[PDB]
């Protein structure tokens, strides 16, 4: 009751977040990209690329778990779509090619939130020092272009876009 001294003892909605439900029509990854704080870097993507699926994922887990221990907010731990390249070698004493092997590339991305400018040197020092074998670390800014590769291709728009131009 209002007048009782025990008013508001059951208050809980201010403890949890609002947790906006993913509406059917409003379903959109609205990401307020933060850029250029006094001491906080923007949203960063830690691109880990390796040829072996097991090795790439194993180091991806280490990066994700390391951030949690260091109180670094992790927005997402998604995975870039894999790319397959057909390795063709040239046949000696000839010109015609032949199927050598089929090699694939696996990419794992651990998106991280802002970090203090002082911690940038320390956090990156641990990462590059622990690159197991051939893992191509790539810490680039989280622009929409780098995030477009996850989605599909839309030739229907490209048919319209070409005629628009």
């Amino acid at each position: 009751y209002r007048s009782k001294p025990t008013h508001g003892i059951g208050r809980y909605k201010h403890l949890v977040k609002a947790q906006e439900p993913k509406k059917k029509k409003g379903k959109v990854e609205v990401r307020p990209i933060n850029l250029g704080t006094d001491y906080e870097y923007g949203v960063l993507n830690i691109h880990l690329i390796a040829y072996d699926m097991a090795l790439a994922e194993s180091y991806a887990q280490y990066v994700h778990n390391l951030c949690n221990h260091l109180a670094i907010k992790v927005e997402e731990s998604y995975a870039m779509p894999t790319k397959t390249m057909e390795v063709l070698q040239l046949q000696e004493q000839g010109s015609k090619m032949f199927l050598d092997a089929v090699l694939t590339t696996h990419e794992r991305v651990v998106q991280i939130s802002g970090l203090s400018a002082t911690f940038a040197e320390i956090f990156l020092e641990i990462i590059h020092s622990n690159l197991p074998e051939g893992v191509k670390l790539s810490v680039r800014e989280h622009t929409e272009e780098d995030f477009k590769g996850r989605f599909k291709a839309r030739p229907e728009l490209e048919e319209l876009l070409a005629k628009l131009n």
């Binding site: 001294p5 008013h7 949890v16």
Partner: peptide, 29 residues
């Protein structure tokens, strides 16, 4: 006519602001 509580409130120690910093329960037990 609001009245003053006779002592400390149960959940007034924790900070309402900066919810992400506070660690959650993550478990029911």
């Amino acid at each position: 006519r609001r009245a003053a509580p006779l002592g400390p409130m149960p959940n007034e120690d924790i900070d309402v602001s900066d919810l992400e910093r506070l660690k959650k329960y993550r478990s029911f037990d």
